[PDB]
């Protein structure tokens, strides 16, 4: 059941989840093609486009999924799984809101499974940097989606 409020609550909840994960990761440490908003997407004030922005939100969130799957193997297994599962609900909500149309693109499964093994073959240091970069980038994307959705 979709509501702007439920979508807003879902983003805000995942953001607090990312924060709590970043905290329980930065106490052991103390390129990637991650989704990122650009002006052309229509999510910022300058060149704001409702239709293209909603497509970029759903696309970016579907692309982030391989990276959230990576986080699951990387002791608070319930917390990292909760981030992944809470994201899937966010995608469903936005797919339901966009019910007017879909022309995305959805990512290739075998390309993701290969990227996943490549990320899992790195040493522990690189794996901790990968985690930091995934979490920061996902936070940046969710914060822009949050701002944009308010006007859509």
């Amino acid at each position, epitope marked *: 059941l979709t*509501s*702007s*409020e439920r979508i*807003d*609550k879902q983003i*805000r909840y995942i953001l607090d989840g990312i924060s709590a994960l970043r905290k329980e990761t930065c106490n052991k440490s103390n390129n990637l093609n991650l989704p990122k908003m650009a002006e052309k997407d229509g999510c910022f*004030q*300058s060149g*704001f*486009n*409702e*239709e293209t922005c909603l497509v970029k939100i759903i696309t970016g969130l579907l692309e982030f999924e391989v990276y959230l799957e990576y986080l699951q193997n990387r002791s608070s297994e319930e917390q990292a799984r909760a981030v992944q599962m809470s994201t899937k609900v966010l995608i469903q909500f936005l797919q339901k809101k966009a019910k*007017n149309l879909d022309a995305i693109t959805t990512p290739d499964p075998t390309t993701n499974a290969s990227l996943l093994t490549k990320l899992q073959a790195q040493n522990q240091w690189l794996q901790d940097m990968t985690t930091h970069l995934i979490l920061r980038s996902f936070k940046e994307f969710l914060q822009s989606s949050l*701002r944009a959705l*308010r*006007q*859509m």
Partner: antibody
Amino acid sequence: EVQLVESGGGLVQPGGSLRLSCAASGFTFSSYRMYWVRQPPGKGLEWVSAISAGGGSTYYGDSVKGRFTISRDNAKNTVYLQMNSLKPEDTAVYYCANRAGWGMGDYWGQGT
Amino acid sequence: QTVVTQEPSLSVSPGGTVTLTCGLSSGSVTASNYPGWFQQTPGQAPRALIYSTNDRHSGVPSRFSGSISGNKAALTITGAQPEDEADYYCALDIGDITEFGGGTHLTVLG
């Protein structure tokens, strides 16, 4: 500064039709959700309807859902409130506004 | 159907502190409800004071402040002035819509 000018309300017969306009100036109109609030005589504030930045999404109060229609226009920077099947219960001062965003707060007009 | 609840009337003495609350029947008020506070002087158009829970509108005195305390949205006036005697309407974004509370008549004593 930012300005919002409501027009053109008036006397109308029950079951009648009216079209409200809201001329916006001084802000990136195409980048904001716009909304309408009504104030019946001697009564509190009542939310009427809302329109997303590009008009894709429209929302209404369940006491006017079937009767009212919200529309938007750019580069004319105007929002409209098409009011059909008008009832004495719709007698009020009508205000247009922008939802906060991009470092700006909710600005309301003078009313019609 | 959700109900936005606010105290019908409240009062304060000059230079005193007063808190106006705004709540839901369907549970707790969160950041997602983007609470707004509007001041209305008689025969005048409403003026937005606080937006997005705690953000102050252009030219709003620093004595007016917003927050969420408990399960409700709150408006605190620190060092009330005679000019602060007015109606205060709260607005919460519930579902896909926005709902105003009945409003609070604040009297500055006495």
